[PDB]
Design a protein around this ligand. Structure first.
Ligand SMILES: CC(=O)N[C@@H]1[C@@H](O)[C@H](O)[C@@H](CO)O[C@H]1O
Ligand SMILES: *[C@@H]1O[C@H](CO)[C@@H](O)[C@H](O)[C@H]1NC(C)=O
Ligand SMILES: *[C@@H]1O[C@H](CO)[C@@H](O)[C@H](O)[C@H]1NC(C)=O
Ligand SMILES: *[C@@H]1O[C@H](CO)[C@@H](O)[C@H](O)[C@H]1NC(C)=O
Ligand SMILES: *[C@@H]1O[C@H](CO)[C@@H](O)[C@H](O)[C@H]1NC(C)=O
Lengths: 596, 5
């Protein structure tokens, strides 16, 4: 309750290292805030008696400094190491900088050091004496150099070591094997290199090992089988090569395994195909090969499977619907040279599916099957079914479908009306096909649709008026997409768009487009459009991109469109237009090919 | 267009 005087000196030193005052602390000698540091915010005290200090003069001792998200700036003063009873130092998510005093890593009573999300820099101190530390958390800072080779010399109680999102380099020190009690080890997102020292596989209590985003190389040792408590293993984005070891019977707690973007080859180990515990599996972007085999009686926890962008061949496994928890499958860039199995009509757990660029044949059969997966919300068929016909068979219904992408298939046919059976559609991409006919008016009736890519087809006739009444354009999970490659994490990462470009469309642009106030992107380029440009286009308040180029448009560019305050890209190029322009800031390539 | 990988 009454602040120890030596702790006050120490906290005073701590304040001196800061750029700005902490509210509630007595920052200067002026008796406004109380002088008792135990009264201050972020400071917790315990009596000297309860800490087992036998001093005749009792006092409250500072046991906890909890400063998270305080906008603290400046260095971490060497004086903090003068708080000899400090158990918890939590400075997470502040603006702090400078290097770390070796004195801090000398505190005998410290349980928790959380410096995460700051700007700290320099070498990490090589001598670390923290006999009481449970938690070493430096995640997201600017530290560089070798990980201290002596790191585990004195850390007898260590549970969590998080060095992730820093600049550390070199190999994982062989001494890492002496952190016997460690449960969480993150090294992820550093500069680390070389092979994993065999010594790491001695850490028997390890439940989370995160190595992703480094330069680590060599093989993945069969000694991995020794880390028997592993829940989560992430080796993604490294230089690892060879085969994935067959040790997954031994890791029976492993629910998360990500090896993606490595050099792995060979078949998936059969034990992984039998793993009872595995929930998230991502092997994508390797050289893995063979027939894909999954034992669905065994893998009852499997919820997400990403084998994409691998060297596998053979058929699409027909037993997959029997993995009854499996909700998401990314099978893209596996060259099946096959049809989707009929059993897929029974895959009722499936919510997300991508066969993109997988050599799938017979879109007719494929869709007649997949319509029966009642929970399917997203489907990616891009780059398959080359030159085939997009079936108009009316009996097709994808009821819960949110996202439908079949692009760059060169598909013949028209926009099929059975798509109106997907009333909750958010994203539709039919682009880069051979599609013909007119653009169906019922598209305007889809109240959740914010993204429509019809571009690069043979479409003729008018722009349907209903598009100007599109509700989501008028008014206000993991398996990412790439746009042709820029990554988008979910459907809503795509800004609302109408792309009708590279068709034969005719008629004019409707004034009612000005009703679409949530539209970010309108691309009408390379059509046969005629008439004027409505002044009502000034009504689309969210418009960023408007490309009318390569059309037959005439008249004046309405000065009113100057009212579009977010408009970042504008092209009227290669039309026939005349008169003044309101906007001096758009390049000439935007106005060129007009006369006037 | 959109693909996955
Ligand atoms: C092809 C195959 O291995 N079948 C297995 C079977 O032996 C086992 O009883 C079950 C649960 O482990 O998984 C399935
Ligand atoms: C640090 O404190 C923040 C709240 O400010 C908390 O969310 C975080 O878990 C703390 N760290 C530890 C190791 O308890
Ligand atoms: C695939 O992996 C390689 C390393 O093997 C990496 O450099 C590349 O960026 C990865 N590609 C994608 C799209 O993830
Ligand atoms: C599709 O697959 C082909 C053949 O592997 C490859 O060359 C191309 O880069 C892939 N394209 C996309 C967008 O996946
Ligand atoms: C349109 O689609 C074809 C067929 O894939 C493609 O080769 C061409 O580059 C595309 N044109 C534009 C401008 O997108």
């Amino acid at each position: 309750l009454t602040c120890n005087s030596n702790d006050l000196k120490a906290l005073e030193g701590f304040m001196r290292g800061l750029e700005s005052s902490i509210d509630g602390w007595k920052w200067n000698e002026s008796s406004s805030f109380s002088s008792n540091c135990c009264d201050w915010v972020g400071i917790s005290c315990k009596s000297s008696v309860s800490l087992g200090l036998d001093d005749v003069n009792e006092s409250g001792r500072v046991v906890e400094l909890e400063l998270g998200r305080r906008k603290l700036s400046g260095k971490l003063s060497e004086s903090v190491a003068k708080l000899d009873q400090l158990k918890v130092l939590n400075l997470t998510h502040n603006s702090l900088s400078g290097s770390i005093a070796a004195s801090l890593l000398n505190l005998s009573n410290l349980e928790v050091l959380d410096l995460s999300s700051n700007d700290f820099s320099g070498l990490f101190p090589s001598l670390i004496n923290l006999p009481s530390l449970r938690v070493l958390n430096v995640y997201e800072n600017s530290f560089h150099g070798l990980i201290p080779a002596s790191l585990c010399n004195n850390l007898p109680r260590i549970r969590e070591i998080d060095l992730a999102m820093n600049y550390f380099d070199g190999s994982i020190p062989v001494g890492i094997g002496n952190c016997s009690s460690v449960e969480y080890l993150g090294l992820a997102s550093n500069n680390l290199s070389g092979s994993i020292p065999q010594e790491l596989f001695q850490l028997s209590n390890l439940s989370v090992l995160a190595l992703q985003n480094n330069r680590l190389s060599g093989a993945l040792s069969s000694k991995l089988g020794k880390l028997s408590n592993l829940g989560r293993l992430d080796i993604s984005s490294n230089k690892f090569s060879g085969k994935i070891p067959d040790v997954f019977l031994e890791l029976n707690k492993l629910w998360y395994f990500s090896a993606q973007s490595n050099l792995f080859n060979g078949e998936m180990p059969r034990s992984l195909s039998n793993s009872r515990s595995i929930s998230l599996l991502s092997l994508r972007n390797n050289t893995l090969s063979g027939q894909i085999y999954l034992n669905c009686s065994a893998m009852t926890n499997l919820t997400s499977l990403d084998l994409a962008s691998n060297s596998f061949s053979g058929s699409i496994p027909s037993n997959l619907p029997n993995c009854l928890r499996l909700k998401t499958i990314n099978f893209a860039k596996i060259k099946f040279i096959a049809q989707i199995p009929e059993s897929f009509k029974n895959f009722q757990s499936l919510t997300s599916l991508s066969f993109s660029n997988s050599s799938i044949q017979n879109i007719s059969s494929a869709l007649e099957i997949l319509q029966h997966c009642q929970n399917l919300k997203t489907l990616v068929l891009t780059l398959n079914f080359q030159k085939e016909e997009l079936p108009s068979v009316p009996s097709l219904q994808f009821k819960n479908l949110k996202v439908l992408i079949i692009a760059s298939c060169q598909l013949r046919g028209t926009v099929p009306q059975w798509l109106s059976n997907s009333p909750s559609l958010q994203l539709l991409d039919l682009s880069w096909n051979q599609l013909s006919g007119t653009i169906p008016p019922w598209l305007g009736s889809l109240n959740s649709l914010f993204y429509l890519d019809l571009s690069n087809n043979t479409f003729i006739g008018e722009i349907p008026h209903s598009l100007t009444s599109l509700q989501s354009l008028v008014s206000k999970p993991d398996f990412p997409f790439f746009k042709k490659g820029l990554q988008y994490n979910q459907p809503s990462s795509f800004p609302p768009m109408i792309d009708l470009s590279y068709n034969s469309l005719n008629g004019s642009i409707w004034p009612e487009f000005g009703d679409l106030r949530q539209l970010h992107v309108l691309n009408l380029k390379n059509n046969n459009l005629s008439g004027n440009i409505p002044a009502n286009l000034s009504g689309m308040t969210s418009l960023e991109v408007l490309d009318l180029s390569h059309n037959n448009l005439s008249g004046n560019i309405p000065p009113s469109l100057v009212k579009l305050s977010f408009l970042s890209t504008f092209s009227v190029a290669y039309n026939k237009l005349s008169g003044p322009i309101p906007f001096q800031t758009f390049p000439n390539s935007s106005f060129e090919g007009n006369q006037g | 267009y959109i693909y996955t990988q």
